[model samples]
Structures are given as C-alpha cells and as structure tokens.
Target: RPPQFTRAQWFAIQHISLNPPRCTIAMRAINNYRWRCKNQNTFLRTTFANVVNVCGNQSIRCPHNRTLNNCHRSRFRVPLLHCDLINPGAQNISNCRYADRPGRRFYVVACDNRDPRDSPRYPVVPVHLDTTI
Candidate 1:
C-alpha cells in the first residue's frame, strides 16, 4: 500500500480545474479531434468540425490567442508534462513527454484521486484551493 499523505497535501488535489476558462472550450474541440482520429467516419468529422466551429466563433476570446487566426488555425495546444502526486514530498514525481507551446506552457499536478477512501493510493492530499496560499 502507498504511504498515507499528510492533511495539508491531501486538500490541494481536490479542486484542480482547467485554467483560462476558455481553454476548456478549446479542449472540448480537441477531444472531438481525437475522436475523429480514432474513427475515420465522416459523421464524426462533421460533428467535431461543428464543435470547433462553435468554439471558433465564441465571443469569449481564448486566453492564449494572439489573434483570431491563431485560435482558428489550431485545434488545441496540449501540455508538455503532467505530474500526479499522492502526497507533497519529492517521492511522488512523475513526468511525460507532452507538447508545451508558448501560450499553453503550464502543467497540472493533481494530488488527489477524488476518493476519500482511496486517498492513500495517491501521494498528495486533497485540499481546498485557498488553503494552499
């Protein structure tokens, strides 16, 4: 069994969410792209295209967009690395070779797995976002 995490470490992971808000919209567009990639059906492509289309015309400008063309041209920028932790110590570190672009340079390190019973499975504890400051 994994070691138990401290109270402080546990709370940090529960509230992780997408940043810039608009990126969530763009991410949904990317998920559509991935689904289209898996199934080369025209119907999927059309549906994915529609998803992109809606996000493309959104009045809420994407936080990372320098111009409308930039946002319209790409599906979405993915992160370069993701680090999931069960606790706050150095032992929980893990890395992946994900892409990191200029506008989307941040990484997510989720500490909790969202199950109170399974909290020990992860190294970090779930905490309220405000408690970290």
Candidate 2:
C-alpha cells in the first residue's frame, strides 16, 4: 500500500530524500546561497539543493526516458563536498525502483538545519538502501 502522508510531509520528503547527509557536505561550502525560483517554469526552476547527501555512492538506474546510459546502471562513488555533486536544483521526482523489494522499502530520515536563515523549506528524508535488487 502507498504510505499515507500529508502534502507538507511529502514536500519535506522530496527535499530530504534528494539531500542526504552525504550531499550536505557539498552544500555546506556554499554558505548563504538559497535556491529559489520566481516563475513556474518547472523544467528550469530549481527544485532541490544539496542532493549529494542522500544519493551518495549509489548506483542510479536511469529510467527509460533518460538519455545518458553510461552511468545509469553503474555505481559511482560520490566525493565529499564535491562541487559536481548534483545537477544543481531539482528535476523530476520519482520513487526509487530499488525500494520495491520485499522486506526493504523506502524510509525517511529527518535532518535539522542549524542555520536560522537557511532552514530547508521541507524536512529531510532518506530512503533505506536495498541491496537485494
């Protein structure tokens, strides 16, 4: 069954899921930059910042619609505080395919922002790792 979550909770989940602790190290370098968008251009608008924290060192399988296939199935080790962490901002948000396995499912991990000025618009959530898939 699909987990029951409020819109606010889901919004927080999107941010947290993309910005895991591993990705946080990279974002820390940019002291005061807050990603924002004025227009509703969803394609170009920034939806996520500091994604390296959540998606570090994991093999990301690109969906059928993706163009790049080289890094699609391979596991890449993410570096700490690396500027090339993610494609800055956000894109299409989807459920992790790896999370579909039995006994292993998606989970959320909350992150607290110490900075008062740059607290995350949403809460931090991390999906549990699935090794059997």
Candidate 3:
C-alpha cells in the first residue's frame, strides 16, 4: 500500500510524539522500545491544520512507487527533542534511560483524501511523516 498508516494510527503517533508530558519512563517501557531513540517534536501538537494545509502544494515519490501530490514542508521550524537511550543494554520490558537533545527543524508530512465516514472533522488526513529538515 502507498500509505502505511491509518488516520487513527497517525493521530495516535502524532499525539504521542508531540505531547512530551504523555511520555514517561514507565510508559516508555510499555509503549515503545524497538528503537534506540525516539524523536518528539513538541511544537506540532496544536492542530492538524498546520500540516493538512500543505497538502496539494508539493509532489513526492514515496517508496510505494506512486507520486504523492499531497506532501509539503512546514513553513516554519519547530523545536524538537531526541529522546536517545542512555543505556543500550536495557531490555524492552525494563525501565530505560534517555538523554534528550533539543533542536529545531522543518517537518514534512504526506496527506491524502479520506472517506467522509472515516474522517468526519477533516476531509484530508495526514498519512506519513516523510522527513524533517
């Protein structure tokens, strides 16, 4: 499939990544551990409008070999945090450590049309986190 994530999945990940307070040592152990580091952009939590408005402005070729016309970069940069694990030997079920790095960058997200019944609030929904610059 061209889009790997559903609207609900996209919302959940975005909510988790943008809200720092939702992230905690105990929660992180149960929530995520496949990756050594998790990047959280604190400033993008406000609204889906920020990324949704950029749809139809730019085109990109995703790995799915389809040209997506709804991908675009954010107009401004936002503060981001890299939650890097301090203890590499830690198990997934164990409480882990993080050394966060703060920075700023522009983010790109891909959007696509959604079924009206699927997205009651917005006709278009974000599907992928393409990249950050």
Candidate 4:
C-alpha cells in the first residue's frame, strides 16, 4: 500500500485550507466605533443612589454593598457617574454613607478611559448593518 486515502476524504482534502474568517463577513462589530465602544462596557463597581436620574433608577435589595465585577448576567443596571466624583475623607467609602446623605458608590465607565476633552471613539465611523426586507 503506497498510503492511506479514502475516496470521499481524498476529494474533500483536494483544497482544504486554514485562514481568517472571510472579509465576506460583515456581521461583526468594529472596535473603537462609538456605538461599539458605548456598548462594549460600563462595568458596575457598586451602587448607592437616591435618584432615578442617577442611573435609570437602578438599585438593589438585600444590598451587596461591595465592589462588583459586572458579573450580574446583565441582570443589574450599570451605575453611571451622575454627580461629581466623591473623594472620601481618610475613610473607606462604606463609612462615608454615614456622613453623606446621598451616600456614594463607584463604577468604572467604559468610555471614561478616554481623555476628558477628547471626542468620542467614533466620529465618522464604520458600521456593518444587515439588510432586511
């Protein structure tokens, strides 16, 4: 026997190849796009709000009162930076609640990684949209 070859396998292997997913794919999101960046993140670190204007009235019950990993399965709303950043005075934040009426919570916003005065991730951006009739 010279070698092993099944008739079906031989035909299938005639031109098999490995490569990146086709540019033919227009169904994926492009990184750094404004919409993409906006949707990419907003990890919730904690929550302590007394206003719906704060972050869509999102709150909790039987409070966890700790740092979050955004591991709530999208079950919880992300806390946005509604008011000015709070700087606790020589005390951990949980202690601040006793002094500050509105209290405080922390979160890492997705877009905050950029500079304070810079334009958004997408200016004139690319988008891949599917057509429907």
Best by TM-score: 3
Pairs with steric clashes in candidate 3: none
Which candidate leads the pack in lDDT? 3
In candidate 4, where is summed lDDT lowest over 10 consecutive residues? 124-133
lDDT for position 4 in model 3: 51
Tens-place lDDT digits, model 2, residues 20-104: 3333232332211223311110010112243314333243543432553222211222221112223334421221011111122
All candidates' lDDT scores?
0.25, 0.26, 0.51, 0.21
Per-model TM-score, in order, reads 0.17, 0.18, 0.54, 0.14
Error of 1 at 58 (Å): 40
Q: Which ten residues in a row have the lowest lDDT in candidate 2?
A: 37-46
Error of 2 at 95 (Å): 25
Q: Order the numbered candidates by lDDT, best leading.
A: 3, 2, 1, 4
Q: How many clashes in each structure? A: 14, 10, 0, 0
Cα lDDT of model 3 by residue, 1-133, tens digit:
1155456344435432555443345235323424443433222443566556555455565443355455566666765444444556664424555554455676566666776765676667666664566
Candidates by TM-score, descending order = 3, 2, 1, 4
Model 1 regions lying over 4 Å from their true place:
1-102, 107-118, 126-133
Q: Write the per-residue lDDT of candidate 1 for residues 17-68, one digit (tens) a residue.
A: 2332222232332223222111100011112222233233323233343343
Look at candidate 4 and give me any clashing residue pairs: none
Which is the winner by TM-score between candidate 1 and candidate 4?
A: 1
Question: Which of the predicted structures, 2 or 4, would earn the higher lDDT when compared with the native?
Answer: 2
